[PDB]
């Protein structure tokens, strides 16, 4: 033929069949032992998610949400993702004492449901009403963005203490139980309005620590609705929403490390 005879062509096939078969069987074996060394409830390493990311619902083309108020299908793209998220926080999804629980309607302290063990059933998560998100189809004019803190197993988000000076200096400082979120731009051509649990501009600490998908399915993380009823129009406004805390940090590279990058433009 090309290389060899039929007899040789066969033998080279019988070899590579057994050979690659063995190699596949060995590869699988090493994957088995790897998995055997891992927990079902907690990942081996968590230093790469460490400082929590802050992500929002409006799917930004490039950290930007520009549209026209005087146009219907101009914002119907951002309403798709906005709906996708809030559709999960339905009351019909949170039914019965299992696996949900009614928690303080005001920001409270942490809740420990034991260890990362299966020695108990599904760890009961705090309910969250999308109805706590006042004012927010969504904002056809002047968007109503929804913030979110990235989930990390066993992470206890710790707010800053009012020992020294603060950006939003001491205003509504629920020091003990709220992780604040203050959006900014100089360039003050807007109108910041925050909505959340208990009416506070933060995340209620009663939703922590997260026990993971395996130990807490259907779990709901707290949301923070933000509305920009800015009196300006037809210009790119670089708005940055920042979260503050002891376990919260940022990076010049990762522009989502505990903060937002939104470029709103109501070009109408």
């Amino acid at each position: 033929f090309l290389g060899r005879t039929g007899s040789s062509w066969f033998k080279i096939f019988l070899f590579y069949l057994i050979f690659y078969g063995c190699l596949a069987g060995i590869f699988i074996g090493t994957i088995q032992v790897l998995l055997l060394t891992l927990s079902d409830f907690e990942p081996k390493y968590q230093d790469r998610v460490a400082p929590p990311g802050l992500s929002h619902a409006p799917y930004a083309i490039k950290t930007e949400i520009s549209f026209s108020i005087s146009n219907p299908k101009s914002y119907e793209s951002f309403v798709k993702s906005m709906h996708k998220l809030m559709d999960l926080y339905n009351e019909s999804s949170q039914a019965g004492n299992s696996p949900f629980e009614d928690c303080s309607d005001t920001p409270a302290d942490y809740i420990k449901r034991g260890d990362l063990d299966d020695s108990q059933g599904q760890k009961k998560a705090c309910r969250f009403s999308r109805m706590w998100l006042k004012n927010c189809g969504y904002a056809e004019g002047k968007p109503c963005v929804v913030a979110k803190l990235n989930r990390i197993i066993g992470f206890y988000p710790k707010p800053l203490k009012n020992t020294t000076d603060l950006p939003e200096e001491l205003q509504a400082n629920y020091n003990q139980y709220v992780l604040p979120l203050r959006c900014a731009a100089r360039e003050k051509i807007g109108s910041i309005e925050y909505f959340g649990l208990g009416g506070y501009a933060g995340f209620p600490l009663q939703y922590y620590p997260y026990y993971g998908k395996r130990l807490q399915k259907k779990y709901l993380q707290p949301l923070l609705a933000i509305q920009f009823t800015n009196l300006t129009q037809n210009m790119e406004l670089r708005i940055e929403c920042k979260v503050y805390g002891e376990n919260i940090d940022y990076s010049e590279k990762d522009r989502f490390r505990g903060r937002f990058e939104v470029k709103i433009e109501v070009k109408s």
Binding site: D47, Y156, N247
Partner: protein
């Protein structure tokens, strides 16, 4: 610890780099020694 389990989300990449560079250097020296056993 409980609420004070910050160490869980931390890794000393600084020491690791110091050690890694020490090792790389020493392996580089060892190599020179064996090569220079005759030039």
């Amino acid at each position: 610890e409980g609420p004070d389990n910050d160490e869980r989300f931390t890794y000393d990449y600084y020491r690791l780099r110091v050690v890694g560079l020490i090792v790389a250097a020493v392996l580089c020296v060892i190599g020179i020694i064996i090569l220079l056993a005759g030039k």
